[PDB]
Design an enzyme around this catalytic site. Structure first.
Site, mmCIF file in Angstrom:
data_model
loop_
_atom_site.group_PDB
_atom_site.id
_atom_site.type_symbol
_atom_site.label_atom_id
_atom_site.label_comp_id
_atom_site.label_asym_id
_atom_site.label_seq_id
_atom_site.Cartn_x
_atom_site.Cartn_y
_atom_site.Cartn_z
ATOM 1 N N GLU A 17 4.752 6.777 -4.768
ATOM 2 C CA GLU A 17 5.795 6.145 -4.099
ATOM 3 C C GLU A 17 6.761 5.732 -5.085
ATOM 4 O OE1 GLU A 17 7.617 5.298 -1.878
ATOM 5 O OE2 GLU A 17 6.787 6.064 -0.075
ATOM 6 N N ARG A 100 0.861 -6.500 3.503
ATOM 7 C CA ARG A 100 1.510 -6.089 1.982
ATOM 8 C C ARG A 100 2.894 -5.668 2.119
ATOM 9 N NH1 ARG A 100 1.963 -0.718 0.781
ATOM 10 N NH2 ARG A 100 0.348 0.783 1.833
ATOM 11 N N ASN A 102 5.649 -2.909 1.674
ATOM 12 C CA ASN A 102 5.802 -1.396 1.520
ATOM 13 C C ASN A 102 6.992 -0.991 0.866
ATOM 14 O OD1 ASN A 102 4.245 0.909 2.035
ATOM 15 N ND2 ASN A 102 5.405 1.547 3.692
ATOM 16 N N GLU A 120 -3.399 -0.923 5.947
ATOM 17 C CA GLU A 120 -4.302 -0.122 6.673
ATOM 18 C C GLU A 120 -5.755 -0.364 6.409
ATOM 19 N N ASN A 153 9.410 1.230 5.999
ATOM 20 C CA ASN A 153 9.519 2.536 4.974
ATOM 21 C C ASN A 153 10.873 2.544 4.455
ATOM 22 O OD1 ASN A 153 7.698 4.224 3.725
ATOM 23 N ND2 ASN A 153 6.648 4.687 5.470
ATOM 24 N N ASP A 203 9.261 8.767 6.274
ATOM 25 C CA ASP A 203 8.669 7.926 5.406
ATOM 26 C C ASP A 203 9.864 7.280 4.407
ATOM 27 O OD1 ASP A 203 7.012 6.759 3.561
ATOM 28 O OD2 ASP A 203 5.267 8.267 3.603
HETATM 29 O O1 ASO Z 1 -0.491 4.806 4.443
HETATM 30 C C1 ASO Z 1 0.618 3.709 3.946
HETATM 31 C C2 ASO Z 1 1.389 4.529 3.269
HETATM 32 O O2 ASO Z 1 1.922 5.935 3.820
HETATM 33 C C3 ASO Z 1 2.888 6.478 2.967
HETATM 34 C C4 ASO Z 1 3.871 5.803 2.541
HETATM 35 O O3 ASO Z 1 4.798 6.539 1.657
HETATM 36 C C5 ASO Z 1 3.717 4.462 1.802
HETATM 37 O O4 ASO Z 1 4.670 3.609 1.609
HETATM 38 C C6 ASO Z 1 2.699 3.587 2.775
HETATM 39 O O5 ASO Z 1 2.216 2.385 2.167
HETATM 40 CA CA CA Z 2 6.702 4.943 2.007
#
Ligand code: ASO
Ligand code: CA
Ligand code: ASO
Length: 298
Positions: A17, A100, A102, A120, A153, A203
């Protein structure tokens, strides 16, 4: 003319990421969130350095005074690369059971924007609307912009610094706000693009030198180019892996695109269909340039 796609580093990230191009070293910075790693790949020597933190690190950015800043857990941190050290600058979501940070990015005036979400418990199940979008100002003050976010995101800003684009993934939409460069304030959320069904989950996102938006489609195995003024999709670029997560521009004068992706949540099968999953991909020949990343001013 056609594009060319190359896996330049088959890093096998669980969830690669936050790609950021560091032009002063011609290196790509990125994170692997659950390995708690911040990574840096030197595009000339092909070598990668990885520093391991003590909690999930969801984004990383340049810091003008030296070193890096990052989002680690629910904390904005300064990252001493030379010493592998992280000092907390500020914390958010203290009142949350288990959030958290992201996705995060620095704005044109050097403020570190980053949003949160619930962690998650299971790929991909998560408590709804537990996130919020924040920004760390140069004076270390944190502003909270809105909450009720599912999964904060992709985000970026227009070239005239008057518009802020934002993705909450479970809205399956790219939104826009009026944005004030001098104050960091935003307002008047409106939808600019609703994803088609084959584009799956929006995303990561970056803007290009022509003002168009490039969006990584998680499970769509693609990035799409969007015109925010007309609201139309301009182009689709398909990649050899489905779990494309984010994108940025890099290379000479920002003429190449780097795309991150994830290995987590893949079945044994798809892994044999997509052995390059979790890798860093480079796309050349798009004929469009991006723009340089901004650097945190505190
Ligand atoms: O499952 C969560 C994840 O999904 C993909 C995203 O790019 C990421 O930032 C996120 O934390
Ligand atoms: Ca992401
Ligand atoms: O050569 C560097 C330049 O390449 C073109 C990019 O659009 C610009 O942001 C960057 O500063």
């Amino acid at each position: 003319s056609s594009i060319k796609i190359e896996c330049v580093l088959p890093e096998n990230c669980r969830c690669g990421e936050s790609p950021v191009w560091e032009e002063v070293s011609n290196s790509l910075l990125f994170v692997d969130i659950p390995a708690k790693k911040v990574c840096r790949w030197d595009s000339f020597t092909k070598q990668v350095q990885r520093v391991t933190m003590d909690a999930p690190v969801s984004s990383v950015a340049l810091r003008q005074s030296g070193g890096y800043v990052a989002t680690i857990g629910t904390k904005f941190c300064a990252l001493n690369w030379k010493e592998q050290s992280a000092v907390v600058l500020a914390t958010v979501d203290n009142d949350k059971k288990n959030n958290r940070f992201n996705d995060g990015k620095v704005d044109p005036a050097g403020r570190y924007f980053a949003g949160t979400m619930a962690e998650e418990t299971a790929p991909a199940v998560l408590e709804r609307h537990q996130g919020a979008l924040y920004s760390l100002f140069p004076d270390h003050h944190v502003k909270k912009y809105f909450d009720q976010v599912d999964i904060s995101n992709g985000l970026d800003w227009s070239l005239d610094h008057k518009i802020f684009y934002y993705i909450d993934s479970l809205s399956y939409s790219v939104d826009a706000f009026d944005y004030d460069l001098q104050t960091g304030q935003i307002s008047n959320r409106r939808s600019v693009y609703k994803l088609e069904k084959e584009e799956q989950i929006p995303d990561g996102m970056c803007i290009d030198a022509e003002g168009k938006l490039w969006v990584a489609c998680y499970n769509g195995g693609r990035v799409i180019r969007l015109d925010p003024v007309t609201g139309k999709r301009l182009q689709t670029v398909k990649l050899p892996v489905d779990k494309t997560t984010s994108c940025c521009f890099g290379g000479k004068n920002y003429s190449e695109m780097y795309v991150t992706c994830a290995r987590d949540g893949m079945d044994p099968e798809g892994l044999l269909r997509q052995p390059e999953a979790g890798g860093i991909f480079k796309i050349t020949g798009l004929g469009v340039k991006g723009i340089a990343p901004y650097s945190y001013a505190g």
